[model samples]
Target: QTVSLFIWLPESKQKTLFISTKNHTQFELNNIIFDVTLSTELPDKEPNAIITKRTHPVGKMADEMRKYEKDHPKVLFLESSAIHDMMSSREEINALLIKNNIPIPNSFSVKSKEEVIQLLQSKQLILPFIVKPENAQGTFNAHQMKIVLEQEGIDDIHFPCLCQHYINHNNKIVKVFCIGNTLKWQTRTSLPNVHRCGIKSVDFNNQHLEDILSWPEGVIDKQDIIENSANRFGSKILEDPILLNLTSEAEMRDLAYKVRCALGVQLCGIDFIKENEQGNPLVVDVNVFPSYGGKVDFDWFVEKVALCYTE
Candidate 1:
């Protein structure tokens, strides 16, 4: 008899997942049929592992999940713990990276304009630095970023953000997706180099963020995100998915896996970059349950989730 793997994430929450089909109420992984519910009700009256998202604490609803976990002795879980909560933070992730001696940019966690300025005056954080929300999950602006190319641009720095030294990789970015122990990756063109521009703000407008993330081979032109940002129109969108060959393959493999271990979750994404033509790869961002986009196979993803049982 095959085992069942129940998914607790609601349909709306699974949009990034988009694993739909005629038989979507049920999905099969490794010959094991799993039931999925459009509702948030628990499906575990039987013994099986549950792959779930972090349960939200609303109106004692989280208690329902805790009670169920306590009630089911044979039931296992993936990312149904506090470790996921801890890992979903930019500060914690960066600190852990630093502690582990992982390669990353010189960064500082800032609370207000004063702190960012202090670091800037101390020459701790350099010019043309990037600012991102300190909390990994917050408002719509959480993933929003501001690139400061000059002194006046400093005012654009959002508080409770990470002030990181910017690294120019010729407008190319790398993403590595980890499914349990398996890894999948792709390269893509990034927002056109903003070095020439003064202050730039990046708003991952709902769908635009999705396209920029998962499409893998799309080009986000300077004017596409700029113009209102800068008057200049188009200047050759970098079309190569793996532009310039990010030569550090194995380095990225272990780096992605290390991030998974730090977050204590497998289905996640890690973004990295190189300094110049010959610079080493440095981690720029860490994500949870990222959009594997068009690069990952749903079948492989299912198998990877099933393998979680062995761990």
Candidate 2:
């Protein structure tokens, strides 16, 4: 009796993953019980093979999976939208967090260059402000503009950008990884170490950690639902430590389970700004389909995920 395992992975990545899975001892041992497959097409037809039911058309899949879970006996469907769509500025995700009582920095969105210029002309900014396209993430095209009195044409900048209040930290940041509802991993930083923290550096650690951990009482909290659902895995890190600690091991698997439910994320990564003086954690971004880099034990993660599927 072969169990079909359908996973939604990009076609390019699927090939590499297939080769690695074939080399895994656990996969070899359970080869008889499992038959896995990948496809860019949805709803593949294979009796003993895993089929792609929802990658190419995710919007459609989100609807179908909800229905399938209701009607099918044991079939499971995991649906994820593009990270950009979830977190990008157009969605007002940041505002959503603030409205829901989640701690977030003061921010406003502009729609045109003229609006940005108008903001500068108003002379309400403090000193340094962050500017970028509303839908941008990962610091791509993100700029920290210091409002220097010396500049003459600063007001000429346009709108359709984000003029955000800049928070100062001791040049440290934290990245939290959440699997299910459990906080699995946290990487903190003080210096410009992208290799260590897995994201850009910004000052302001006080509120970042405190807001997520202190308020929630557990690793998974209410605010994570709105905050962590905003970006992609490649673009951000898991910034919640309480949630990251959940995946310590098999004995603590329940933590991971709890995190998954709390965050409403099967797999998520969050990035935060850590300030040294204040000692707080401010969530910066969240991502789905987080990359493993095979640094951790794939066998262990796969086993845990498979168990989640069964339970």
Candidate 3:
């Protein structure tokens, strides 16, 4: 028989997902029916839990899950490979965002050294811009170069890096989470500097909380103010059920919904940056297998996941 497992994640931890069932009975690998809602917080007994089938390899987990589900008798996987590839190259992301009419930071891909020099000379870009490899992650072979006056050997310089007009807005970044076509959560993070760009994931909140209060999406007002005000680089709202109930406007919501559809994932966590001028939403980044902690409503989210699994 098929069983459902509910995973529980606490407010203060990493790489830990607790599992239980709705019936208040210990879930074992037996031919029995299991409901995720019965799962509870069992802190000490971490090893032998519902995490068995959830374990996956690190590098290519998405593809692995997809293939595994195909061969397995009863299983389902949700992911977005396009979002993964898009993170590898900002230029590719820029093109997709432009094609979809989604607002994004002004950026260009550089190949030859002369082109970099010429672009620098154009003076159309702003100072304190960001430059690094186009397809790198987690500080793996990545370097942030601040372009100043033009120098020689442009071709000798590295190819395939993003020459982006950095939006110097106090190092604040907003991540918008969407479960399929649903806008589930919006997180605002502030970094100490660009050095921690993609390497660090922590929560921080400051006086800038007011900035998001009147955000255009109208979803920000629904979040917890105090929990949202906690000043940290990577802080997010705790298990706030309000996120799951959010309903978006027809047009902008449809745009994000289309992105989720195009990426072909049942669940996605798309990050967006509020525009520097009018706070217009911009689809900056998308994550298919993103961490489930941002919204932390595992009971509700898992129910949605299980319902979608049948589809």
Candidate 4:
């Protein structure tokens, strides 16, 4: 019952700038019942795990983690090296899912428009696909994404990018937030299927479902809608969206946990869709930030404090 957790929150003791974008983070771990310590540096003594606010935990910190994990083994809950390698790019996670036989949206890596045309010509990849920066996450530039509803839209492709077969799921996407054995999720409006909507294509550098509600219109929020749902896991009005209706809760639960096992990351958020409501659920995105922003909970707290084997 006594699990120790080290929470690393570092930044400018840099003033308001760093703290402003992340003050919402510190409050995110207050509810867990574990033995918790807030620190700017890690301890070498007894502890169950450590959670860092940064993705690239390296140099002296990396050195500290590598050595400490070796001395304590399973206590850290993950390997130091695994975090660095796995978090390097989105493609790395996709590779792992493929290796584990997990279904991901059919995808290919491309460098230019010519390469994309070839895939289209060879029929290796069809139209109505998604184009995004291969290294998406952390920043908006990389998050720039587009759904190609026409062949000519392929010219809008970027160099050194990833192209995924767009899955049409009735304009809704499922987001699952996993904390060890605990799981929570929400259904949110997804980018509209342009082809079905009589449109040519759609483009934006968006990541979270919050972006979808605010896109091409007034600003909206996941929290606002989540609150409206009264379940703490949103889905209300675009005045806008679903209850999954058909996808099994148990199966989606399995997929979320499988992703955690594949990446070996303790805290994870996954975005996926079920084609036509009956097709196999295809994983579309993965990130260490579970999008449980601003507010924090006990389950999320323990997982972050416990979920760090270089994941």
Name the candidate that leads on TM-score: 1
lDDT of 3 by residue, 1-311 (tens): 55554343222322332232233433333334445432224222221112212222234444544454355424332432334455456676566667766666677788766676677688755443455567533333433343321233232345777766555433334455555544555444532222222221111123233433332332222233334444422344423222432223453467567666555555556655443323555555564445554335545555555544544
Clashing pairs in 4: 78-309, 79-309, 83-310, 144-205, 237-240
Task: Give the local distance difference test score of model 2.
Answer: 0.42
Evaluate model 1: give its TM-score.
0.75
Per-structure clash totals for the candidates = 1, 41, 20, 5
- What's the candidate order when arranged by decreasing TM-score? 1, 4, 3, 2
What lDDT score belongs to each candidate, Candidate 1 first?
0.63, 0.42, 0.45, 0.62
lDDT of 1 at 290: 68
Tens digits of per-residue lDDT for model 1, 249-309: 6776777777776666767778777777346678888766667754344455556776666
Candidate 4, residue 91: lDDT: 73
Q: Per-candidate TM vs. native?
A: 0.75, 0.53, 0.54, 0.70
Question: For residue 275, what is the lDDT in candidate 3?
Answer: 36
Model 3 TM-score (2 dp): 0.54
**Which of 1 and 3 is the better model by lDDT?**
1
TM-score: model 2 vs. ground truth:
0.53
